[PDB]
Design a protein around this ligand. Structure first.
Ligand code: BJQ
Length: 340
């Protein structure tokens, strides 16, 4: 690679490692914020729009219930998520602003991106044109080059985790499955339609799973549906492992060729995982129009700007029951979460 890229990534890794080795902790508290709206809710956590009472800034606060994290065997994953997020810095990664814990919950306070999930926009328009899909894909390629150079695997690429910001660029959110891995790792995680075959088959897998997931994402952006779609997970998994994918006739030949190379079942043949690494992707004809530096510098005009009224607008998110943020009188699971 150009010495320019090598030197950039060396500095990126140095800066990451300093924060990785000495993580920030306990940088705000709950009563510094007002709750505005619940933006998402799951089996062990929620995301809420909050406002800082002194500065007036809006943030997305992820709240994890310690007891449920333990019950669902997510302890290490939650520690990974926060330790990684506090240490990374890249234009297409959502910024962690504060973190803290209390007797009941873990809190990560992040930039709020009012444009909403790529998923919503994709489903509302049907499919993205190839230029539009390529603009987003280029951001993911650069983000994975950054993450992988820090020995990080992301492991949850899907349209719901990609927020569209005020300039129309992507912000990757949700580092719940991200992990620092030199070599292989084994945990079954991700989302069914996006899992690489080696995850399904319970192998020791590596960063090549992220490049597989990029193939799934690009297909879904350009087609409007994912390549291995089926009604139940087991049927999805059978399709993933089969080595068979069908492409819409509207796909360009270049798109089909790139996707066949990202969706290689044999991980030793998969683009992003060959001897030339990410450059096989960056140099592919489908990316011939992409100015990688201009994308990194946010100098390209985006395909669209989401419609929203301001930094507190929640219109691009959907409606959930509002539930308490209860804090027990007694500390729960203190030992498990000491490092948070
Ligand atoms: C496309 O490149 C690849 O798949 C590389 N693993 C090179 C290779 C090809 C065939 C057999 C062995 C090795």
């Amino acid at each position: 690679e150009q010495e320019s890229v090598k030197e950039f990534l060396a500095k990126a890794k140095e800066e990451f490692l300093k924060k990785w080795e000495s993580p920030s902790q306990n940088t705000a508290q709950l009563d510094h914020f007002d709750r505005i709206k619940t933006l998402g809710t799951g089996s062990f956590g929620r995301v809420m729009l909050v406002k800082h009472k002194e500065t007036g800034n809006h943030y997305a606060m992820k709240i994890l219930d310690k007891q449920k994290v333990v019950k669902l065997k997510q302890i290490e994953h939650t520690l990974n998520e926060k330790r990684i997020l506090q240490a990374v810095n890249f234009p297409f990664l959502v910024k962690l602003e504060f973190s803290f814990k209390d007797n009941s919950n873990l809190y990560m306070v992040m930039e709020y991106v009012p444009g909403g999930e790529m998923f919503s926009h994709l489903r509302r328009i049907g499919r993205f044109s190839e230029p539009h899909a390529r603009f987003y894909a280029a951001q993911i390629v650069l983000t994975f080059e950054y993450l992988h150079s820090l020995d990080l695997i992301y492991r949850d690429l899907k349209p719901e985790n990609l927020l569209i910001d005020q300039q129309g660029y992507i912000q990757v959110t949700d580092f719940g499955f991200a992990k620092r891995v030199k070599g292989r790792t084994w945990t079954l995680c991700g989302t069914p339609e996006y899992l690489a075959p080696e995850i399904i088959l319970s192998k020791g897998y590596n960063k090549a799973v992220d490049w597989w997931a990029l193939g799934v994402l690009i297909y879904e952006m350009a087609a409007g549906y994912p390549p291995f779609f089926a009604d139940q997970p087991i049927q999805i998994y059978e399709k993933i492992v089969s080595g068979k994918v069908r492409f819409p006739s509207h796909f360009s030949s270049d798109l089909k060729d790139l996707l066949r190379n990202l969706l290689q079942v044999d991980l030793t043949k998969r683009f992003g995982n060959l001897k030339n690494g990410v450059n096989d992707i960056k140099n592919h004809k489908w990316f011939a129009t992409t100015d990688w530096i201009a994308i990194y510098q946010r100098k390209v005009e985006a395909p669209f700007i989401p419609k929203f009224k301001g930094p507190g607008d929640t219109s691009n998110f959907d409606d959930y029951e509002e539930e308490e943020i209860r804090v027990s009188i007694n500390e729960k699971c203190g030992k498990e979460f000491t490092e948070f």
